[PDB]
Amino acid sequence: MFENITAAPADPILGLADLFRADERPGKINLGIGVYKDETGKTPVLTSVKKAEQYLLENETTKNYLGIDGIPEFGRCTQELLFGKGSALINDKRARTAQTPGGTGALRVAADFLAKNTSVKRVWVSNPSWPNHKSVFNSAGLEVREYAYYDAENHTLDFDALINSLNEAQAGDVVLFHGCCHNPTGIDPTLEQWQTLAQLSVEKGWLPLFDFAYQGFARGLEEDAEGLRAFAAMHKELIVASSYSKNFGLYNERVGACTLVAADSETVDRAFSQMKAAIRANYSNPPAHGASVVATILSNDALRAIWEQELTDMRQRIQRMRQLFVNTLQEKGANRDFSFIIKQNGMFSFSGLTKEQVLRLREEFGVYAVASGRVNVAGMTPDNMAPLCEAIVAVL
Amino acid sequence: MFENITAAPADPILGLADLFRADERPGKINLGIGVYKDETGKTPVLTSVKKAEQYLLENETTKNYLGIDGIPEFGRCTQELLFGKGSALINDKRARTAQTPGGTGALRVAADFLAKNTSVKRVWVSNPSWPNHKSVFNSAGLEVREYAYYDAENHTLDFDALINSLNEAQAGDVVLFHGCCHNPTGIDPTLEQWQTLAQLSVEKGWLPLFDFAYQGFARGLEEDAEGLRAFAAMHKELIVASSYSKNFGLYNERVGACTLVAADSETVDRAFSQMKAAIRANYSNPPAHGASVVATILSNDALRAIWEQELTDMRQRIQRMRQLFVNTLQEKGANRDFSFIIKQNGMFSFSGLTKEQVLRLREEFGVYAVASGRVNVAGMTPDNMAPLCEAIVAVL
Numbered sequence A, B: 001m002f003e004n005i006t007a008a009p010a011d012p013i014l015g016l017a018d019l020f021r022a023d024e025r026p027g028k029i030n031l032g033i034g035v036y037k038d039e040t041g042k043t044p045v046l047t048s049v050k051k052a053e054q055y056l057l058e059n060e061t062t063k064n065y066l067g068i069d070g071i072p073e074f075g076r077c078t079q080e081l082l083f084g085k086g087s088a089l090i091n092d093k094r095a096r097t098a099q100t101p102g103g104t105g106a107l108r109v110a111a112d113f114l115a116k117n118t119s120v121k122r123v124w125v126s127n128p129s130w131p132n133h134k135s136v137f138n139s140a141g142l143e144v145r146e147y148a149y150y151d152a153e154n155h156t157l158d159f160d161a162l163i164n165s166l167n168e169a170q171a172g173d174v175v176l177f178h179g180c181c182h183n184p185t186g187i188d189p190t191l192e193q194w195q196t197l198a199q200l201s202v203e204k205g206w207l208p209l210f211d212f213a214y215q216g217f218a219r220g221l222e223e224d225a226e227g228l229r230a231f232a233a234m235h236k237e238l239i240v241a242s243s244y245s246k247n248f249g250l251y252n253e254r255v256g257a258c259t260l261v262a263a264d265s266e267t268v269d270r271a272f273s274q275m276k277a278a279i280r281a282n283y284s285n286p287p288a289h290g291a292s293v294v295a296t297i298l299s300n301d302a303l304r305a306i307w308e309q310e311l312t313d314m315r316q317r318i319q320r321m322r323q324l325f326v327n328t329l330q331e332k333g334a335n336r337d338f339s340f341i342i343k344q345n346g347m348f349s350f351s352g353l354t355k356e357q358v359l360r361l362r363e364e365f366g367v368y369a370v371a372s373g374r375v376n377v378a379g380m381t382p383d384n385m386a387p388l389c390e391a392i393v394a395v396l
């Protein structure tokens, strides 16, 4: 049965990680990482998370299965983060949330739900996007089409190209939007651009699918949800796939949510029953530990305060590294405008380096980025900034 | 998009759980439960698990993502449980294991892998089986066919009917076998029957898929794997979907494994790369907490000893309840042979009651079973046995 199976394309992350490991050079630097790292190069467990885990160890009396949609408090706190406390969508009971194994799990549950229960055949994704988006939608049998996004000349959002591309989208197609901290570019629509897109989506009959993996990493929890909320004000229906992997540092516990919104309670409940069916036939019910940590934190004033500060600390360290990177490149004689880095949001940006410059950085200087030139600014520290920037200047 | 979606068929578990909750009668008894319960009617966290969770709280320094296939030690311990320490399959590196979100996750990963990378179109499942088997395989686009299994007259394995049914299976079809503690019947093949099936499967070109959700609940860890090991001795290729939900009481942490076996290391590694691709496009990588508990326990002599005794305690309590049930039915004047209950394995058996007797038990006596007459013997206790049996006798 298996003798003729073709191997999956080589895993580019890992391999990049593998090459980094094998590199014997002192002063090697890994900007190809997916996760947040602090000033010491660690990805620690958040203190709020450790406190919540201690509480669960002390208080849990069973591991009895959660419902298909997971912990009710997790769903409620999730909807409040997304839509705001006192949102009409919440008051009108127009939203239902399933706790999922990570953002990826949320996207796949959305995809399976759409493939099996609707006429959706096609999902529109930005060029560029997280590479796994295509894999997830394709796995559910959905076609993926790309819309223009990145102006490589000006390192900004090519808003005209975006709108023009999306004119090819038919009514009933899904359009995927990154809620904030676009991956890989860090370029997000302004509120007015979000509002323009919200109106256009209503007019054209697109089903919006928001992917919200970085809430809090751009400007703040509420500000980062403005785009979503602009859409939610205008649409009867949408879906949100969210992730707590980065903003709680809960990567490996697989903590996310798929939130379904419809015109009214009757309709969302009926549709959600099929979303639960899609979950039941996939992983049955979701993993408790990580989501329980999230619910415990979000629902407790003390823990939530500690967590919000920890998130702020991450967001601020990222911003500081963006500023330090631009300053240091200027001071090391780059003689070229990198100011776009300060205005971009989250861990990721395109450096503007070519694939060959990236290869040269790895081979000659032991500086590792993704082949697209995407860099994780959280891989930068005050201590590694100078040699990193000297390496970059050398390949310009 | 959602206005015309048909609601999923009513969830029969839940609803049964809901009806039980709403029942105001004292003396109500729930035999429709899916989980293990102890003599006090609780599903506690195992002591070995609490000890391991304390160790993880003290020692974990990151929640950084696991690899796609999860914790290496978890994979190694899993393969040893399945195949035995020093197995040729292990020594020859013919097996690869992915840690998954539960047994269900393992089955779905198997299904997606098979649908996308092989000619498999059809999976053969026992009549009866766990109802979610059909849902999982169908979700991946695979047809499900049934093979005869249960002799309702003698409450035994209809081995002739089984072999005759499976003659319709074509070479390259998948045949699913419950490793031990068949769900819902508790009827397992003898070793000689397993050996007969192993030979037949080789001759007919079936790909065996073992579902092993109850290892340790029949006779013991090694004995319960005899059937699998008989197949593994004969086949170049097979797949095992295993679950630690019942035998570690880790239900809600979603702890299982999908183990792929091929003729040699080269072939299994190549095929496994596609299994990892199927995981990446589903939930990305698996939840750490539960699997880390399992690895911590299985790899430590002290914790593993505590856990093995806790598992033995569950297995023995189940057996005691089977014996007590048969004795008490005789003593309450059933005047009918229920001895088949003593010979069946695990939490579940068909009581032999009809759908209407089951309905009558719920309505008149507040005794709850599944409509098929399946009962969970772990819902029985010394204290509830007499009224339970008096209720059953009354509807005979």
Ligand SMILES: Cc1ncc(COP(=O)(O)O)c(CN)c1O
Pocket: A101, A102, A103, A104, A105, A130, A178, A183, A211, A213, A243, A244, A245, A246, A251, A254, A255, A256, B283, B284
């Ligand atoms: C845009 C985007 N969507 C979803 C995911 C997947 O998130 P998770 O690791 O929680 O599955 C990521 C990675 N955090 C991402 O960058």
Ligand SMILES: Cc1ncc(COP(=O)(O)O)c(CN)c1O
Pocket: A283, A284, B101, B102, B103, B104, B105, B130, B178, B183, B211, B213, B243, B244, B245, B246, B251, B254, B255, B256
């Ligand atoms: C035969 C069988 N297969 C798989 C499963 C699913 O296991 P899990 O709850 O770990 O997903 C079950 C339920 N334990 C089962 O009875």
Ligand SMILES: *c1coc(C(=O)O)c1
Pocket: A034, A035, A130, A183
């Ligand atoms: C978090 C995990 O992976 C990423 C990525 O960009 O690949 C973010």
Ligand SMILES: *c1coc(C(=O)O)c1
Pocket: B034, B035, B130, B183
């Ligand atoms: C464990 C969870 O569900 C079962 C079942 O038979 O439904 C076992």
